[PDB]
Amino acid sequence: GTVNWSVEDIVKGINSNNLESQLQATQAARKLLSREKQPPIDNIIRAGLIPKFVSFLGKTDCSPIQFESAWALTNIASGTSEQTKAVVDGGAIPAFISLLASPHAHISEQAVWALGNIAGDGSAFRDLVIKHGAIDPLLALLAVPDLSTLACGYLRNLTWTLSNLCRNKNPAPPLDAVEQILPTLVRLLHHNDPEVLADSCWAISYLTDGPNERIEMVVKKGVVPQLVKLLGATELPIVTPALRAIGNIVTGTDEQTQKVIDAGALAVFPSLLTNPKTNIQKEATWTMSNITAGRQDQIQQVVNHGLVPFLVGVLSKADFKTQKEAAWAITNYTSGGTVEQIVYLVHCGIIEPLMNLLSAKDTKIIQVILDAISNIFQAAEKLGETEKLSIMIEECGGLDKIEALQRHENESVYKASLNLIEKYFS
């Protein structure tokens, strides 16, 4: 019936005066847009059908055409920013928001999905959806005693669309919108569905990427413990966004960082630091680099969980990007750490692998590493163990590289090297 219509026919039918003829034509448009391969989005837009669809959204007496056009408009909004713009331009936002209160859960869901695609386009549309007052209607849909009574897929759609209202940074979602969503987001962060969980985390990770005031909004809701737990999830789809949230929160104040340590996060790192998925490993080392940039009592917490060996490990063998984060972790550690701690760092075998990394084609890492060595000597002086450290670097051939990095096209490399030799190898 409605399978494989030509756009000329769909146009023909939507232009007829027959509500039914229009419905069948609209369902045909929906199917064109739902075929697994290259949907004629541009031709549909080009035919000028969006205003008609947006218009069918309001036909309360014909729920079917409401659903069909909703789906159709949802898929158009799924494309490029321009295509999504086309839908927004047609007056669809206020209309889709209206459908959230529909008696037909499947039409409400569609409304939720469409608003999801629109806000997902970026800051602007995100904030335009918010100005049309979509948060209230959305949040109302989840106001039930037990989330479990809701349809699995229905609940996932809401969690997803909500995550997009928390997405993007320039600018970040309005403050009071985050405040209005958070209580519901926290509740979803405790649901038993892997998807609701992964998306909830993503949402939380978004709200925690930016100024510390933003992080505080989240941390103050007591979700760190729950994040640390999801951090130990079996499913990569959950662990990835969770590790990210945890990683952002520790880019803030040391008090906020302390929350994750207290939460028990550190215990999950021996795993994360040897994780098969390289990206989890990169994110974990990065997270560690911000923990070693904290207080000494916090650096000790790292030491206590036998994590220094794990860093020595990452520094020794890993994707280069993970090593760069490892180099940072170490250089931050040797930056604010106590002598005794910088001592331990060496007894863990950090020197050799740190040196082999001076053989990298990355000028910034060489600065990070060299900078680290300096911090170690600086602590070796307070002990007078300066020569022992000198020899050590020579044993593994580190001197045979610093002594070469004086003749390096960079300024810091050039100088930091020369100074190192000059001051510790003469």
Binding site: W286, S289, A293, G294, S335
Partner: peptide, 7 residues
Amino acid sequence: PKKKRKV
């Protein structure tokens, strides 16, 4: 600020 928000 050593804490690098490598974002």
